Design a protein around this ligand. Structure first.
Ligand code: CEI
Ligand code: CL
Ligand code: NA
Length: 185
């Protein structure tokens, strides 16, 4: 995977501004850990019918990821501060990768996989995509699967999902471009 960072790249900034606007529910230019974790647990995990343990595992992953960006409960954050937080998460994750230590994004994927499953199906991904709202388009979910290296059953394994997302969120890896079809730039 690309390990070199590209944090000044306008396309990398744009990718995060897209995600930030997506989590900015009321469109006030701020996001909060409170609304995000509520979305993870009270909404996504509820509709997926995750077990209480599966919900909690998913919840602690979401918390760790956004706390990695400097976020905490009861505090609003604007995009530039979030972005610098995300640069700090990104380097922490890449150092973990470089040490053969599990990343937060790997752990979150394990939590997602646990709800469904060592692989997930196109229909299962489509469910997360639509329910989380990251990728409501069936065709974009289908594009994710066309993009990724799948097993002989056409299913997605956790290591492939991990390396794609490490490249997509952290390093603007050209191999990761197109991961969400048109759903996320
Ligand atoms: O989309 C997921 C689920 C997932 C997918 C692949 C993977 O390897 C691991 C996990 N997680 C995710 N992973 C990363 C981001 C994300 C990335 C960049 C950014 O600036 C903001 C959010 N968003 C999300 C969606 C989300 C869900 C619940 C609450 C908030 C957000
Ligand atoms: Cl909000
Ligand atoms: Na907001």
């Amino acid at each position: 995977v690309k390990l070199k960072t590209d944090f000044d790249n306008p396309r990398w900034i744009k990718r995060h501004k897209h995600m930030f606007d997506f989590l900015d529910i009321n469109g006030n230019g701020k996001i909060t850990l409170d609304e995000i974790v509520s979305k993870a647990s009270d909404d996504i995990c509820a509709k997926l019918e995750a077990t209480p343990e599966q919900t909690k595992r998913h919840q602690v992953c979401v918390e760790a990821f956004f706390r990695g960006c400097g976020m905490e409960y009861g505090k609003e954050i604007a995009f530039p501060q979030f972005l610098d937080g995300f640069k700090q998460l990104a380097t922490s994750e890449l150092k973990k990768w470089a040490r053969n230590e599990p990343t937060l994004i790997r752990e979150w994927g394990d939590a997602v996989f646990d709800i469904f499953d060592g692989t997930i199906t196109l229909d299962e991904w489509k469910a997360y995509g639509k329910i989380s709202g990251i990728s409501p388009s069936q065709e974009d979910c289908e594009a994710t699967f066309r993009h990724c290296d799948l097993d002989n059953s056409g299913d997605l394994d956790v290591d492939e999902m991990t390396r794609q997302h490490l490249g997509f969120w952290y390093t603007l890896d050209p191999e990761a471009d197109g991961l969400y079809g048109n759903g996320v730039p």
